[PDB]
Design a protein around this ligand. Structure first.
Ligand code: JTH
Ligand code: MN
Ligand code: MN
Length: 230
């Protein structure tokens, strides 16, 4: 039921260096907030197809967490910032826009439970995006998985892919310790049964309650930065 193979993640590590291409595009950052409790904060940032920061935030309340993440976005030179606005993050827009006052950074609330982005468009690579994915969480996790798989095929099987459709982890920038944390989370993201035959993923709650593993905050952050607002 897992959607991402560890082998793809290994291949994607420094893939831009292996295949000789450079990060090009917008810088997108995303934050997975949490209230004070067991669930850590997540932050991820990419420059185009190259992930450059993965960070985890401990011992913070929700507002401290948002301050931490917006500061990271600023440090990273983000053009776009997203955060998880389902549940506890629903009220964070005010603090977030305040943090970016005077800066050219857009802030977008990500709601993983909503219907997929552009749900009426034909599903590519009669059947629409909305027939395929239950919600945005599923849609953007599969976008991530698709990038990783294409990168794996390019790195390991020498199959050409446009760098725009790939994803590389900058190991030097991210750090080995945080990369290992991320990978342990990404390999636990799993499909759940859906009675309308759509792709749907286990929620953070189901993951910890049904099979006792910690919330994938770093993976959720990375997944949200797959969406580039405008
Ligand atoms: C209640 C728990 C498991 C939970 C719910 C929703 C989220 O968006 C989370 O990001 C999270 O880390 C934990
Ligand atoms: Mn969340
Ligand atoms: Mn979380």
């Amino acid at each position: 039921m897992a959607i991402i193979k560890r082998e793809w993640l290994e291949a994607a590590t420094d893939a831009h260096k292996k295949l000789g291409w450079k990060a090009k595009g917008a810088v997108v950052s995303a934050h997975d907030p949490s209230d004070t409790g067991p669930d850590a904060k997540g932050y991820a940032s990419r420059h185009g197809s190259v992930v450059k920061r993965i960070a985890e935030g401990l011992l913070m309340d929700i507002n401290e967490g948002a301050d931490w993440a917006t500061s990271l976005a600023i440090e990273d030179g983000a053009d776009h910032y997203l955060w998880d606005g389902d549940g506890v993050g629903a009220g964070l827009r005010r603090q977030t826009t305040e943090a970016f006052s005077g800066k050219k950074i857009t802030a977008t609330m990500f709601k993983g439970s909503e219907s997929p982005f552009d749900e009426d468009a034909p599903y590519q690579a009669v059947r629409t995006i909305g027939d395929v994915f239950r919600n945005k969480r599923a849609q953007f996790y599969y976008a991530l998985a698709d990038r990783l798989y294409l990168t794996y095929r390019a790195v390991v099987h020498g199959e050409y892919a446009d760098p725009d459709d790939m994803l590389s982890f900058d190991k030097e920038a991210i750090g080995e310790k945080m990369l290992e944390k991320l990978f342990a989370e990404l390999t636990q993201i799993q499909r759940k049964f859906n009675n309308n035959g759509k792709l749907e993923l286990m929620t953070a709650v189901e993951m910890k309650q049904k099979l006792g593993i910690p919330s994938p905050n770093l993976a959720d952050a990375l997944m949200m930065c797959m969406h580039c607002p405008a």
